[PDB]
Design a protein around this motif. Structure first.
Motif, PDB file in Angstrom:
ATOM      1  N   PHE A 103      11.501   7.722  -3.342  1.00  0.00           N
ATOM      2  CA  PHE A 103      10.678   8.349  -2.345  1.00  0.00           C
ATOM      3  C   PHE A 103       9.283   7.725  -2.255  1.00  0.00           C
ATOM      4  O   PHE A 103       8.760   7.187  -3.231  1.00  0.00           O
ATOM      5  CB  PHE A 103      10.529   9.797  -2.692  1.00  0.00           C
ATOM      6  CG  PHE A 103      11.791  10.593  -2.680  1.00  0.00           C
ATOM      7  CD1 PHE A 103      12.105  11.362  -1.577  1.00  0.00           C
ATOM      8  CD2 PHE A 103      12.643  10.608  -3.769  1.00  0.00           C
ATOM      9  CE1 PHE A 103      13.260  12.102  -1.546  1.00  0.00           C
ATOM     10  CE2 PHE A 103      13.798  11.350  -3.738  1.00  0.00           C
ATOM     11  CZ  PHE A 103      14.106  12.094  -2.623  1.00  0.00           C
ATOM     12  N   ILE A 104       8.689   7.816  -1.072  1.00  0.00           N
ATOM     13  CA  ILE A 104       7.347   7.322  -0.841  1.00  0.00           C
ATOM     14  C   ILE A 104       6.355   8.411  -1.235  1.00  0.00           C
ATOM     15  O   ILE A 104       6.150   9.363  -0.488  1.00  0.00           O
ATOM     16  CB  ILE A 104       7.156   6.974   0.641  1.00  0.00           C
ATOM     17  CG1 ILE A 104       8.279   6.051   1.146  1.00  0.00           C
ATOM     18  CG2 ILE A 104       5.775   6.370   0.883  1.00  0.00           C
ATOM     19  CD1 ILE A 104       8.430   4.753   0.397  1.00  0.00           C
ATOM     20  N   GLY A 159       0.784  -1.221   0.000  1.00  0.00           N
ATOM     21  CA  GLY A 159       0.000   0.000   0.000  1.00  0.00           C
ATOM     22  C   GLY A 159       0.819   1.277   0.000  1.00  0.00           C
ATOM     23  O   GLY A 159       0.453   2.254   0.649  1.00  0.00           O
ATOM     24  N   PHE A 160       1.930   1.283  -0.726  1.00  0.00           N
ATOM     25  CA  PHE A 160       2.652   2.526  -0.941  1.00  0.00           C
ATOM     26  C   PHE A 160       3.151   2.634  -2.360  1.00  0.00           C
ATOM     27  O   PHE A 160       3.276   1.639  -3.067  1.00  0.00           O
ATOM     28  CB  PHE A 160       3.798   2.715   0.070  1.00  0.00           C
ATOM     29  CG  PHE A 160       4.963   1.772  -0.104  1.00  0.00           C
ATOM     30  CD1 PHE A 160       6.055   2.132  -0.877  1.00  0.00           C
ATOM     31  CD2 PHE A 160       4.984   0.546   0.546  1.00  0.00           C
ATOM     32  CE1 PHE A 160       7.133   1.278  -1.016  1.00  0.00           C
ATOM     33  CE2 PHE A 160       6.062  -0.310   0.407  1.00  0.00           C
ATOM     34  CZ  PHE A 160       7.138   0.058  -0.375  1.00  0.00           C
ATOM     35  N   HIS A 161       3.422   3.869  -2.760  1.00  0.00           N
ATOM     36  CA  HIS A 161       3.897   4.149  -4.093  1.00  0.00           C
ATOM     37  C   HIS A 161       5.296   4.713  -4.028  1.00  0.00           C
ATOM     38  O   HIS A 161       5.545   5.686  -3.317  1.00  0.00           O
ATOM     39  CB  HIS A 161       2.995   5.154  -4.783  1.00  0.00           C
ATOM     40  CG  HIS A 161       3.388   5.399  -6.195  1.00  0.00           C
ATOM     41  ND1 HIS A 161       2.962   4.587  -7.227  1.00  0.00           N
ATOM     42  CD2 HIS A 161       4.208   6.316  -6.749  1.00  0.00           C
ATOM     43  CE1 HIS A 161       3.480   5.021  -8.358  1.00  0.00           C
ATOM     44  NE2 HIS A 161       4.246   6.065  -8.100  1.00  0.00           N
ATOM     45  N   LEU A 162       6.200   4.079  -4.767  1.00  0.00           N
ATOM     46  CA  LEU A 162       7.605   4.451  -4.790  1.00  0.00           C
ATOM     47  C   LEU A 162       7.859   5.232  -6.063  1.00  0.00           C
ATOM     48  O   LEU A 162       7.502   4.775  -7.154  1.00  0.00           O
ATOM     49  CB  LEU A 162       8.467   3.194  -4.776  1.00  0.00           C
ATOM     50  CG  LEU A 162       9.960   3.418  -4.553  1.00  0.00           C
ATOM     51  CD1 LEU A 162      10.214   3.884  -3.118  1.00  0.00           C
ATOM     52  CD2 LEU A 162      10.729   2.150  -4.862  1.00  0.00           C
ATOM     53  N   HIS A 163       8.463   6.407  -5.915  1.00  0.00           N
ATOM     54  CA  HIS A 163       8.716   7.315  -7.026  1.00  0.00           C
ATOM     55  C   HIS A 163      10.195   7.666  -7.085  1.00  0.00           C
ATOM     56  O   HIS A 163      10.791   8.064  -6.083  1.00  0.00           O
ATOM     57  CB  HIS A 163       7.889   8.593  -6.864  1.00  0.00           C
ATOM     58  CG  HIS A 163       8.120   9.603  -7.942  1.00  0.00           C
ATOM     59  ND1 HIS A 163       7.524   9.513  -9.184  1.00  0.00           N
ATOM     60  CD2 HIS A 163       8.875  10.722  -7.967  1.00  0.00           C
ATOM     61  CE1 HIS A 163       7.904  10.536  -9.923  1.00  0.00           C
ATOM     62  NE2 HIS A 163       8.721  11.289  -9.211  1.00  0.00           N
ATOM     63  N   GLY A 164      10.778   7.523  -8.268  1.00  0.00           N
ATOM     64  CA  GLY A 164      12.199   7.738  -8.459  1.00  0.00           C
ATOM     65  C   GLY A 164      12.456   9.042  -9.177  1.00  0.00           C
ATOM     66  O   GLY A 164      11.618   9.504  -9.951  1.00  0.00           O
ATOM     67  N   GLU A 165      13.593   9.612  -8.805  1.00  0.00           N
ATOM     68  CA  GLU A 165      14.139  10.780  -9.426  1.00  0.00           C
ATOM     69  C   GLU A 165      15.251  10.304 -10.336  1.00  0.00           C
ATOM     70  O   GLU A 165      15.927   9.307 -10.084  1.00  0.00           O
ATOM     71  CB  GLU A 165      14.687  11.747  -8.376  1.00  0.00           C
ATOM     72  CG  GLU A 165      13.649  12.218  -7.370  1.00  0.00           C
ATOM     73  CD  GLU A 165      12.491  12.945  -8.023  1.00  0.00           C
ATOM     74  OE1 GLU A 165      11.338  12.741  -7.588  1.00  0.00           O
ATOM     75  OE2 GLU A 165      12.734  13.721  -8.971  1.00  0.00           O
ATOM     76  N   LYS A 166      15.407  11.057 -11.402  1.00  0.00           N
ATOM     77  CA  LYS A 166      16.398  10.833 -12.446  1.00  0.00           C
ATOM     78  C   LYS A 166      17.764  10.497 -11.855  1.00  0.00           C
ATOM     79  O   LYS A 166      18.288  11.204 -10.990  1.00  0.00           O
ATOM     80  CB  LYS A 166      16.437  12.028 -13.395  1.00  0.00           C
ATOM     81  CG  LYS A 166      15.111  12.191 -14.123  1.00  0.00           C
ATOM     82  CD  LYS A 166      15.041  13.430 -14.989  1.00  0.00           C
ATOM     83  CE  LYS A 166      13.699  13.489 -15.707  1.00  0.00           C
ATOM     84  NZ  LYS A 166      13.572  14.676 -16.596  1.00  0.00           N
ATOM     85  N   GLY A 167      18.319   9.404 -12.369  1.00  0.00           N
ATOM     86  CA  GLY A 167      19.224   8.538 -11.632  1.00  0.00           C
ATOM     87  C   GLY A 167      20.483   9.193 -11.088  1.00  0.00           C
ATOM     88  O   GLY A 167      21.187   9.856 -11.836  1.00  0.00           O
ATOM     89  N   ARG A 168      20.825   9.004  -9.815  1.00  0.00           N
ATOM     90  CA  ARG A 168      20.171   8.119  -8.862  1.00  0.00           C
ATOM     91  C   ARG A 168      19.948   8.982  -7.633  1.00  0.00           C
ATOM     92  O   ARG A 168      20.527   8.750  -6.569  1.00  0.00           O
ATOM     93  CB  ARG A 168      21.096   6.949  -8.553  1.00  0.00           C
TER      94      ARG A 168
END
Ligand SMILES: [Cl-]
Ligand SMILES: [Cl-]
Length: 88
Positions: free
Chosen positions: A28-29, A15-24
């Motif tokens: 983040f939640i 029940g969480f969504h993981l979001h990435g920033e342009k590497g690396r």
């Protein structure tokens, strides 16, 4: 400061969504679903993921981190840190 969240997976995942920033620049939640294992474990939107199951993941890719989360079936422990202050 960094803190550990211990999650036990439900039938609809964590029940969480993981979001990435342009590497690396990190993972983040983005969202914590109401009534989910993530909410029960006190994960919070905005949290930066520092460790998964005791291993530092700063500088790993989104896929690497997701794979670490999936590696142990049914549970995961996330060391996360919120960010309340930025000087810009
Ligand atoms: Cl935050
Ligand atoms: Cl927070």
């Amino acid at each position: 400061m960094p803190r550990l969240c211990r999650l036990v997976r439900g039938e609809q995942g964590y029940g969480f969504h993981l979001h990435g920033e342009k590497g690396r620049r990190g993972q983040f939640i983005r969202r914590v679903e109401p009534g989910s294992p993530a909410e029960a474990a006190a994960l919070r939107a905005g949290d930066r993921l520092v460790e998964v199951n005791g291993v530092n993941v700063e500088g790993e890719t989104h896929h690497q981190v997701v794979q670490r989360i999936k590696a142990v079936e049914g549970q995961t422990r996330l060391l996360v840190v919120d960010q309340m202050d930025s000087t810009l």
